[PDB]
Design a protein around this ligand. Sequence first.
Ligand SMILES: [Hg+2]
Ligand SMILES: [Hg+2]
Ligand SMILES: [Hg+2]
Ligand SMILES: [Hg+2]
Lengths: 139, 145
Amino acid sequence: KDFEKLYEATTKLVSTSLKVKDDLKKMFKQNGYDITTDHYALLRFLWEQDGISQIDLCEKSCKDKSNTTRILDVMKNKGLIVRKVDVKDRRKFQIFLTDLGRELEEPLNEIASIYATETFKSISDEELPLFTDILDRIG
Amino acid sequence: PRGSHMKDFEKLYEATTKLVSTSLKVKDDLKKMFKQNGYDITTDHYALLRFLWEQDGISQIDLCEKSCKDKSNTTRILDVMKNKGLIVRKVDVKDRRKFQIFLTDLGRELEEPLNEIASIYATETFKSISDEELPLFTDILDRIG
Ligand SMILES: [Hg+2]
Ligand SMILES: [Hg+2]
Ligand SMILES: [Hg+2]
Ligand SMILES: [Hg+2]
């Protein structure tokens, strides 16, 4: 409708995504926090709700089970989260924030806010839900 | 940074999240479709091949400007393409130390079957999206950043 246009949209979608992820990461680094966008998204779920099951974070995350688990080990190794074997299943892992994990909410949210305002500055508030809804119908 | 009409951070974050997820789903599904139909090609590969079908023998340098993925990642990906037999690296006759990138016979032949799959894929993927909506979507993506 027509392929050339469709391919161009797909490309822009995919550049933009990468640029977004990559600039937010840089901004966390510049302020001295060595974290990725993936780590931030995961931590956001936990700040809402601590003790999420790993499978539960599969679902919410996306990824494969391989990738998510590797991202979570990187996070544990930076001290943000710990991993417990569950009180309603040996099979399941529950995921808890450390103190470090809790502490970073204010500041990581602050940097993400600053990134967001600048990044979305040319776009109107009323364009968001259109954008969002077009993304939701893609696929 | 500020003004008199700020957006809600939550909304911006949700949009960023949806943008990211959707990018990933689209990439990953296109890759699955290529493999299911017998071609072991990533979306990154296919995207580079598109640039080569338009402009065979382009410089590594000019490929990176178009590519994004600024240098070491386009390169690593180019290497993987050479070892797949899709492309070939040729020292520039003019301008020392530049390379030009050329399609193999295999890389040329893939143009038709790979565009066929991607095209079908794109139409499915965008079927719920009206003709008026598309450049709107595209224009928002251009203003992001
Ligand atoms: Hg790309
Ligand atoms: Hg994500
Ligand atoms: Hg999963
Ligand atoms: Hg390169």
